[PDB]
Design a protein around this ligand. Structure first.
Ligand SMILES: CCC1=C(C)/C(=C/C2=NC(=C\c3[nH]c(/C=C4\NC(=O)[C@H](C)[C@H]4CC)c(C)c3CCC(=O)O)/C(CCC(=O)O)=C2C)NC1=O
Ligand SMILES: CCC1=C(C)/C(=C/C2=NC(=C\c3[nH]c(/C=C4\NC(=O)[C@H](C)[C@H]4CC)c(C)c3CCC(=O)O)/C(CCC(=O)O)=C2C)NC1=O
Ligand SMILES: CCC1=C(C)/C(=C/C2=NC(=C\c3[nH]c(/C=C4\NC(=O)[C@H](C)[C@H]4CC)c(C)c3CCC(=O)O)/C(CCC(=O)O)=C2C)NC1=O
Ligand SMILES: CCC1=C(C)/C(=C/C2=NC(=C\c3[nH]c(/C=C4\NC(=O)[C@H](C)[C@H]4CC)c(C)c3CCC(=O)O)/C(CCC(=O)O)=C2C)NC1=O
Ligand SMILES: CCC1=C(C)/C(=C/C2=NC(=C\c3[nH]c(/C=C4\NC(=O)[C@H](C)[C@H]4CC)c(C)c3CCC(=O)O)/C(CCC(=O)O)=C2C)NC1=O
Ligand SMILES: CCC1=C(C)/C(=C/C2=NC(=C\c3[nH]c(/C=C4\NC(=O)[C@H](C)[C@H]4CC)c(C)c3CCC(=O)O)/C(CCC(=O)O)=C2C)NC1=O
Ligand SMILES: CCC1=C(C)/C(=C/C2=NC(=C\c3[nH]c(/C=C4\NC(=O)[C@H](C)[C@H]4CC)c(C)c3CCC(=O)O)/C(CCC(=O)O)=C2C)NC1=O
Ligand SMILES: CCC1=C(C)/C(=C/C2=NC(=C\c3[nH]c(/C=C4\NC(=O)[C@H](C)[C@H]4CC)c(C)c3CCC(=O)O)/C(CCC(=O)O)=C2C)NC1=O
Ligand SMILES: CCC1=C(C)/C(=C/C2=NC(=C\c3[nH]c(/C=C4\NC(=O)[C@H](C)[C@H]4CC)c(C)c3CCC(=O)O)/C(CCC(=O)O)=C2C)NC1=O
Lengths: 98, 162, 160, 57, 162, 162, 162, 162, 160, 162, 160
């Protein structure tokens, strides 16, 4: 926490909250399109001042935590897909943005 | 366009916070009428031509001057255009009912409607009367519960015209 | 009209009228008096033509005035005769104009949709137009009857 | 001199297209005589190859 | 567009009335003047380039400023645009004379033309003077009655640009 | 201008017709709604400054760029102009609600407002947002029944601007 | 109307930023050229009538048809209006030079001038020639540097008209 | 668009004159700076993505509400659109610097931009701040004289948006 | 201009100028002094060039100035020479611009229609511009003669 | 569609190898012939109209039946088509001359022309004779060195259409 | 190349080459020998550029050769070096042609799609090309170094 400083910590926390908020929104809308499109361009923005591997670990951890509370196989698979879209997009942006 | 879901999502995204009790209440109210609205939409989509027939019959019986010479609906072309406009109004009211938002109406009917009818000389009050007749017919056809949901958007269109 | 069609056709290619369509206009103009006389004959005899056409239509197609028919009732029969009057007037307009353009614009564009909304049998309209054509051509001489018959034929084909 | 039946293949050299564009590349149309000069010039400028042209009427 | 016969037809159709003696008289008047109109139209079509030549020469001789540098007609492109505008005025005056009505003049020339010249900076007074020049040049070739008839539509164009 | 009573009167005057059952039904509807309209008008007159207060504050909170430097509402002059326009919108919506007709809105406000705002550089999206702000602010003060009535006039203003 | 100082003030108010070194540099440059500007303005004011006299003499010698019958400056009235317009151009060019900004020309001189002259019938090209003659006359009186300064405003007027 | 050479050509063509000593002096002045302009353009094309990165970072640091919920840059979509707008501004300012005239800026960027952002809701002041940030970022990379020349066009963009 | 063409070609592709376009601009600005010298020589000699070229044109084609010719008369001859002055000014504009764009956009678009309206024989205009080519290239050095002659040949081909 | 330089680039790129010394010698050859090629191109651009004049004249002189009725040139339209074909052949021959390669001829001239002429019935022999007529005169104007160098492209066109 | 672009531009509007196009072709051919000398120098020492650029890239971005990186492994490093060799050859081709059309046509159009298929980080392209540019500009003289670095600059911008 100390190395980044208050600004990057605030950005990181609001970004994790952002991910989970968009997961909720997409579950409401019936489509993970908003998460998808908002993640087609995220890695190039993050890379210089952020760790992509750290973000992937964070999204996987949130996936595990969210799947824990659901206690229903269909619910678990749906939320797992709506997080796997985030992991998939950050993985797809290994080269430049599309 | 927008629906109720998009409106709530944007309202809470601009604030940057999750759904509160009022949000979940709005979504539950929107979802509760969903099957009724889809049934009404199926009825209208299936029987649009019929609704046009009774709506036009009522409108032109109440105002025979429209279809007599010197009236705005006096020709085969202008009568066809009148009933075509009525079909437009019915279809876009159905779209708005299914969406739960009047954004589609403002975007794709009201934007340029007044310019069109004032350029062409179409009587706006008579168009409002035709929309009201369509409301009555479609309410009689789809049941009172769906009649109210149709009527809110029919009134939105009527107030947009007048 | 003939002049309107020729001019708009010339306008579509940004050019002056060629001597061919000038001969067009001259031929149309030299035939004006005969067209005016035929319009005289049709206009003066409208009342008899409408009644005779209505009787011929209703005897040839009794179902329209039969119970359950479209023209059943005095008011609906009156509306049918009113439609026949409209189309006779449109025929007179077409005769004076030299083409079917008045008929086209006033009573042909959107007529199928109009009568489909009105639940009117188009075959009934065709039969009525044929009957009124026969009645009108009865009054006119052969040269003029041949001319008006094609306007009536165009109306019947448009309704069909 | 009424019509030409033209088969030609215009490839894509400026970019890679995501949509189909299969019938846009390999196609046969009937082209009017007054338009064939301009159409042939357009196909040639596009880099395409005119495979064969026959006379229809 | 609309011509004299179509004008009478529309006036009687809006009323829903059959043709009567006045309408037949108007139609007979048009049919009487048709041969003169056709002769005038043919003569103009034969001599359109000439009429444009003398009219442009008159206009640019009386107002040489238009074609000197800084003038609206100063370039080959703008001079060609000017003569093209004069050509279109002449052609549509011929069309109106043949039709016997000024409806085509309105629809195909005068709707939005003054705004276009106001945006472009075109001096409408000089355009009207060129139209008057075309009028006097055309009258000499077409004769007395044809000149009066053509001058009606030339003056209609000039007053429409006003 | 024109209200519901005058609207019915003019329709029957142009028809040269007499007041029938439908006319008296419409007159009864207006007289039934009259007391609600008058109560809403008085309430809005009482709280007009408060409504402008809150609507301006909310609009500038949702879109703070307007009041920061470089915004259309950034100066004392331009802020006061925004407040003046909103005060017109409230007063004329109240007039239209009390009349039961939107003819006053058309002729006094909407005929020329788009071109005025486009020439001034005024954002029209933000103006519609301000109108919606006034709408849902006055909806709380007048009550649900009167809110449903004033909302159609606020939406009429918004659709006229959009 | 805005000068260089006002332009700096506005470009810093739109940002909301206070003055920094660059603004002070631009203001210092304006004060550096201010003495030249004041001397040129005083010289032009001292000899305005003379400048108009040689400029109009040169224009009417180069284009004698202007003051002859059939020319736009053939009347005591129209000649006086012509020299009045020339005085306008000189005075407002002096204003713009003294302000260091061409805003006043667009703001009070070139707005609707083309439409005005085209409605009057004034030759635009000849007015531009008068402006250029006025430029040549003014330059010799004001000296090389002040002439180079006034030339940008005279050329601005000439390009705005043409 | 037009460059310095085309600007001089137009100014001398509207006056119907050949190039004088002043014209050749101005053309020579433009020609003397051509190599510097080409080197500056190459340097900017070298670091365009870089300049965009620092400019956007500085803008969003000094304007943090842009990326917070409710800000117009709060999205990856809206962030990409903003940085693409920044790319537009840099590319066209480089075009203007290379040409030596601000005409391309007015023609392809400034015309209609304020109304475009008013429709979209884009804050004009924040865009001006981003343009200024781009100016400080570009000046250091291009050096002193190239920074003066290149910042002239950035100031033109900011003033046009202002 | 050359800079304008490079900029708009880059703009069409939504990119910065390629090394080829920057090299083109470097070449164009490297020749600025030569172009300025050539344009100043042509401007200094405008009266002499117009006088001599008009003389050559009129002796080569006496029909233009003979009675019944288009250039017959003092005023029409003055207009004839004024046109040549216009085109010489356009050629100087093209020399400084580095391309034939100013000539193209001031005195080549609609030139055929303009001279058709003025009954001006286009072959006569071509002969006139060839005479101007000869007279001007006589004044210039060998290297600049070809450069000026290219714009003159372009203008001749545009008129032809 | 490729010149000599792009042709050698292609033949070295397909092998995957870098340029060898022989490639550099081939490149020096084209760079050394470039000025002659450009001079010939300028001559041909200047004399294209005259070349078409005399080429059509000689072609119709040697073969009289073509212009006479029953010939494959007997029509005003068909005459214009023939002269257009010859002009295009000349222009593309000059293009291939400047490029130094015949690839442009294949890609823009012989691409579909052989079978087009075959279907139309154009005689091959007359076309080859016309190509020869253009070549042997163009070589006279361009000089012997450029004559031999247009020889390859002209007889390439002849052999391709053969 | 330059003449190819000029011919395409001329044929686009169906005319002979403009005088400006002829001047740009003369400027191209006049500098052809210097372009060929640059080609000499870049082609001869290709190994120095490629190896030094690879070393600089790997030092700048150690994650590329680190396990889990795209360049990790001997074969993948060989593919890295082969890609750098390809881009050096294309840069020499563009230097010869006088335009970046060889570079673009061979390995720029669709480069992003291919490198997305390979997971190649485009910043890796940018840094490798910048190292190549540094070495090439160092081994050349200033007048040549600027012009050559323009091509590397275009390639880096295309990758970025
Ligand atoms: C759901 C839709 C969505 C998300 C999540 C999103 C993230 C996002 N975070 C940003 C800032 C940032 N984000 C981060 C890093 C954070 N980022 C996270 O992925 C990590 C958990 C964490 C660090 C481990 C940092 C350090 C910044 C500061 C700007 C910079 O990186 O240079 C930015 C750039 C705008 C700004 O400067 O504020 C975006 C677009 N954008 C979206 O449209
Ligand atoms: C969904 C968006 C939409 C709307 C709203 C719409 C309205 C519309 N109605 C039109 C014609 C028309 N519309 C009417 C309306 C009738 N007149 C009668 O008196 C009644 C009062 C009234 C209906 C109850 C008439 C008579 C015309 C023909 C008028 C003419 O062309 O002269 C036209 C002109 C174009 C055409 O004729 O095809 C438009 C644009 N079009 C659209 O795409
Ligand atoms: C000038 C162009 C024009 C036409 C042609 C036209 C026809 C027309 N006929 C109508 C009614 C009618 N029309 C008919 C005629 C049918 N009855 C039989 O089946 C026959 C097949 C056929 C007549 C030959 C009938 C029976 C009605 C009454 C139906 C109803 O009450 O809706 C109506 C509805 C308005 C009214 O009832 O007064 C129109 C608009 N209107 C026009 O503006
Ligand atoms: C949806 C149905 C569909 C198909 C199937 C299709 C095939 C197709 N492939 C094309 C080009 C191409 N296709 C390939 C791929 C080939 N080379 C490799 O070695 C492989 C052996 C092989 C593919 C497995 C290549 C290399 C080109 C470029 C060839 C060129 O332009 O010279 C083109 C020309 C248009 C373009 O380049 O964008 C088409 C139409 N297009 C369609 O719309
Ligand atoms: C450059 C010209 C200019 C000025 C000056 C200006 C003033 C200004 N003052 C405001 C509010 C305010 N202004 C004040 C200041 C007052 N509080 C005390 O009573 C004092 C007497 C007094 C200060 C000495 C306060 C407290 C507010 C907050 C009121 C509120 O939020 O409702 C606002 C609203 C801010 C927003 O909507 O986001 C503006 C625009 N605006 C301009 O465009
Ligand atoms: C129809 C109305 C009208 C009038 C009256 C008129 C007068 C007039 N006289 C002029 C010249 C002149 N006018 C005079 C006359 C003066 N010489 C003596 O002092 C006398 C007091 C007096 C005559 C009795 C002279 C000497 C000039 C020559 C001025 C010069 O060239 O310096 C000019 C300048 C243009 C030109 O020379 O053609 C005008 C406009 N113009 C008009 O359009
Ligand atoms: C800057 C571009 C430009 C050009 C080129 C141009 C040409 C031009 N030439 C004109 C007249 C003329 N031009 C000529 C020249 C021709 N006579 C012989 O045939 C020769 C072959 C040939 C000259 C070498 C003549 C004789 C006239 C007088 C025509 C007449 O008075 O009827 C006019 C009409 C001027 C008037 O009297 O109102 C124009 C506008 N205008 C322009 O704005
Ligand atoms: C840029 C490459 C290219 C060229 C040149 C080309 C020429 C061409 N010539 C055509 C017909 C023609 N071509 C010719 C010319 C030939 N007949 C005789 O006169 C001569 C021996 C010979 C000229 C050397 C003629 C006369 C016609 C019209 C004959 C007809 O109507 O069938 C047509 C058919 C379409 C049309 O004419 O509108 C084309 C496309 N097409 C191309 O893609
Ligand atoms: C001339 C046009 C052209 C280019 C440019 C081109 C690039 C290219 N590089 C490839 C492999 C590769 N390229 C690289 C190099 C990259 N990865 C590292 O991270 C570095 C950042 C970076 C080098 C600086 C690597 C590591 C591979 C191996 C990837 C694999 O085989 O899975 C491949 C896959 C096929 C093969 O290696 O045979 C292609 C097609 N191909 C072409 O036809």
């Amino acid at each position: 926490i100390a190395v980044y400083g208050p600004e990057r910590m605030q950005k990181s926390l609001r970004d994790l909250d952002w991910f989970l908020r968009y997961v909720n929104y997409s579950l409401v809308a019936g489509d993970s399109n908003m998460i998808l499109l908002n993640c087609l361009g995220l890695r190039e923005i993050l890379e210089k001042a952020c760790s992509i591997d750290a973000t992937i670990v964070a999204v996987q951890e949130m996936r595990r935590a969210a799947t824990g509370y659901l206690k229903s196989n269909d619910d678990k698979e749906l939320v797992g897909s709506y997080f796997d879209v985030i992991i998939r997009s950050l993985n797809a942006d290994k080269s430049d943005t599309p | 366009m927008q629906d109720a879901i998009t409106s709530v999502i944007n309202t809470y995204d601009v604030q940057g916070k999750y759904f509160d009790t009022s949000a979940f209440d709005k979504l539950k109210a929107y979802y509760a009428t969903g099957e009724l609205r889809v049934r009404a939409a199926g009825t209208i989509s299936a029987n649009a031509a019929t609704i046009i027939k009774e709506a036009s019959a009522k409108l032109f019986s109440n105002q025979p001057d429209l279809v007599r010479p010197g009236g705005n609906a006096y020709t085969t072309r202008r009568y066809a255009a009148c009933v075509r406009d009525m079909d437009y109004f019915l279809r876009y009211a159905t779209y708005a009912m299914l969406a739960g938002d009047t954004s589609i109406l403002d975007e794709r009917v009201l934007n340029g409607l007044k310019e069109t009818y004032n350029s062409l000389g179409v009587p706006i009050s008579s168009t409002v009367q035709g929309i009201q007749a369509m409301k009555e017919v479609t309410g009689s056809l789809v049941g009172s519960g769906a009649a109210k949901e149709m009527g809110v958007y029919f009134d939105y269109l009527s107030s947009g015209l007048s | 009209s003939v002049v309107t069609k020729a001019i708009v056709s010339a306008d579509a290619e940004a050019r002056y009228l060629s001597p061919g369509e000038l001969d067009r206009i001259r031929g149309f103009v030299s035939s004006g008096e005969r067209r005016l006389r035929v319009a005289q004959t049709l206009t003066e005899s409208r009342e008899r033509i409408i009644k005779q056409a209505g009787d011929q239509l209703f005897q040839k197609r009794p179902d329209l005035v039969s119970p359950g028919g479209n023209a059943y009732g005095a008011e609906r029969t009156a509306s049918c005769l009113r439609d026949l009057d409209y189309y006779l007037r449109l025929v007179t307009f077409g005769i004076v104009a030299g083409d079917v353009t008045p008929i086209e614009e006033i009573g042909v564009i959107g007529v199928k949709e109009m009568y489909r909304n009105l639940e009117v049998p188009l075959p009934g309209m065709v039969e009525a137009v044929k009957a009124m054509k026969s009645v009108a051509t009865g009054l006119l001489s052969g040269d003029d009857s041949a001319e008006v018959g094609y306007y009536f034929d165009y109306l019947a084909g448009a309704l069909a | 001199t009424r019509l030409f039946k033209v088969t030609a293949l215009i490839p894509s050299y400026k970019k890679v297209r995501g949509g189909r564009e299969l019938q846009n590349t390999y196609f046969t149309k009937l082209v009017e005589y007054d338009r064939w000069f301009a159409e042939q010039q357009r196909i040639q400028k596009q880099g395409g190859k005119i495979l064969s042209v026959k006379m229809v009427a």
